[PDB]
Amino acid sequence: KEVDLPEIEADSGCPQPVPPENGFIRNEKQLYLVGEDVEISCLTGFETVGYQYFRCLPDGT
Amino acid sequence: PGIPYPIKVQVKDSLDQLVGGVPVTLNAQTIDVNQETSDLDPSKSVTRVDDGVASFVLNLPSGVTVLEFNVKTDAPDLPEENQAREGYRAIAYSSLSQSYLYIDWTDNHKALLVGEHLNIIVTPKSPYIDKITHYNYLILSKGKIIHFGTREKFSDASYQSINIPVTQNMVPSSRLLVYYIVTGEQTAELVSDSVWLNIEEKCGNQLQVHLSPDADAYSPGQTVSLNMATGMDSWVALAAVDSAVYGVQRGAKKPLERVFQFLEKSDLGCGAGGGLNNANVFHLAGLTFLTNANADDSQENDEPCKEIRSYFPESWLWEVHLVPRRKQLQF
Amino acid sequence: LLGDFGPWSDCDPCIEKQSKVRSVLRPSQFGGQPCTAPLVAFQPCIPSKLCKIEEADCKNKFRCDSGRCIARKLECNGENDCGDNSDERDCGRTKAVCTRKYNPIPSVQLMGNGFHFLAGEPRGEVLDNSFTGGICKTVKSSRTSNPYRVPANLENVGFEVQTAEDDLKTDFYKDLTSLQGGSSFSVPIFYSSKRSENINHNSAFKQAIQASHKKDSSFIRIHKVMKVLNFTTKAKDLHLSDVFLKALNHLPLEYNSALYSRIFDDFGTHYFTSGSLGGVYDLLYQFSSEELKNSGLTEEEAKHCVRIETHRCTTNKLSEKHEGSFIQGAEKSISLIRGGEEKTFSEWLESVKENPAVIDFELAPIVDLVRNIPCAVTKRNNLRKALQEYAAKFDPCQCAPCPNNGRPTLSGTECLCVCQSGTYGENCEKQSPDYKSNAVDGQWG
């Protein structure tokens, strides 16, 4: 974990998102690309209810 | 050194637009190679609306290392408190043989035409020997070398003018470098220079489309003919768009409007030209030489240069047709 | 028997040549027209590169024509060097920094360079202390001058000449040569280990041991030391020589015994940490052991007789000639001196101030200086494996046993077979009337 920061916002991309309660996001990354969608799953034990995905907007959210 | 140094400045307004009729002046301090310095006499001129660029020329003492020029703006309304001031610096050509080279003219027209033979004045200031074997020049464009020239040098004058015929291959833009070789008692050292060559945009095969009926306005639904005309066999791609599409919004630029300018990006080198010793001028022109005389440092890979039903909707007439010589279609 | 010829690879451009090297097997011992026939043969090639120092990154700039890159902002003042000839650029045109005109140390090059442990010579330039570092530091000395500017590479330096002998008078360290630590830890080498001495000195003795022929040859030694300077090198970060780094920059990334072996040959096995510079008066004398019995036996005594300049002890030790002839004063004397009318010793004493030398030196491995280069870690380890195989060539083994407990040595391609006192002539062919041939002590092997 070097301080850096690795983040270049001139490249326009999202940071690692915060999962719902009981977390567990798969394929963990430090910086996500715009238009990329990451699936979220639940820890042992639960079941994902509803549409489960997070898509990176053009803006950082 | 010994050659008058051209300085051409341009003033832009708040948003990316040139201004004219605006007087500007500069202050410079010429320093001597050994030490100390000298203050150069200031020069004032205005930017012409027609040209768009202000022109300055500074002649310096032969013992100058580098020069610094501070450009400031001058207007009767302009206060000294709120004004525009930009300082700049230029480093001299470095040669252990003390010999230099320079070229003139080149696009002041503005730009250039096709088929016309153009002459360029060159000077070999501070030579080791006034007698030079032969003059060699390489004209390049589109990131490639189009032609290889050769010339002879005579004592008839201090500055010789070389004539370069322009070709169809150079249409968007071009660069020309002129190098002359000398033979020293130990090792040989060649000197060169390069300048950007701008030229009129002209297609290899001229394409002209014109409607067969000639009228200011056409009645709706009128059967009309369209005529394609080309120099050589060519495929045409037509698009007929309404003028009302743009429209939304902010002018919506143009369908293309920039092609040769986008085709001009093929150039490997950056800037107009010139550089330290022989190497830097070549690499800035987009080339790397291989010779016995001078060594070429590549400065690694790094290139800092960046900017340096119906009736009736849109759109219709989306087609691709082969056009041998002249071809016509009716609709 | 020498060895098979090596193939040619990786052209020189800096040297603009193609070279190969041959290994040597079974070095000459008793005679038989030794190896000769130069090991490395050079051939003309076609240069691929421009012979420049290459460097990774250098985002912080500002690069030099040599390519040292000089991380901090040196430009343009004061010294504007970064390689020969001052590489310009740097300068010009803007003055100034580090004013007041400080004078450099007469010889900074000897504190630089490097030392070959096995050969005993300052082979080639490594340190190159000429680098200023942008910091202006100077030390003042007795008799000189004016101040003297301190190189960045040296951590500390001072002129410690004090208390007129005294020191050189308490010197000469009377010793008669005959038949941590520890001494066994000096065999693998690998720096200090407190390498400060631990034995020394530079070996020109190849002529002395060869002169042990036909005689019993008992030796005696006296030495004086005058330290004009005491220097210490900063071990954290060092600015390498343009020459050394150039040959270091261009090396095969794969391990090559031949090529890497040329590094130690050219630049030396070690570099100096701490240590002092100056000059020394060293002289070795040879006397026949038959003479000590005829002239009377004085062991601890007559060792004091060596002092002399400036009938028992009265006239002896290098006959005048006639005045000492009856008391002998034979035979041969050699010059072990290092560094540098009326008072000839004072003539070279002032000369050692003009042209000094490294006297008492402490060293560190050359492998420690390979830090911060392209593929640094890779070349470090490969250089460690190179020295291990390199030291093997010099360490005497195949020299074969010498009769009468003789210890074999190694000088170039010849063993020379140094024999103990009481042995007649070189190669241990004959024995003295002292009649002890029994010993024959063992060694590896």
Add this chain to the structure above:
Amino acid sequence: TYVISAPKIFRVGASENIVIQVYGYTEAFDATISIKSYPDKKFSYSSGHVHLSSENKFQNSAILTIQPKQLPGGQNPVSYVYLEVVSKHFSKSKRMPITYDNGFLFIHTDKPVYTPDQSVKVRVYSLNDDLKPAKRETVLTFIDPE
């Protein structure tokens, strides 16, 4: 003297003109220029051949091209390649970089703005390094405003 000039960066799948000039002599010698791989030792991409004469005034140029003969996988491949020149009086070599950017692509849409439930006419104009049409396969991807 033998000054050989080339582009700073070679272009993969392109025609790169290499020019050579000589100091001149009473003797007319032939020359050869080629582009050899970093495995020098052992391979050759292409070989140009020229002839020198008083008619040519001791200067000539032959075009050199690099076909996609590069090794599969290990993307990005090659980078870089070696350039050589073999002549009677001189022989010299230099390493030069390569680029996989070749030619030009112009996308032309029938309209700048479209309404929902409407087709978008699209055509692309492909060109070589020589500006010739350069018949090549092309992929066209569409991206949401998101």
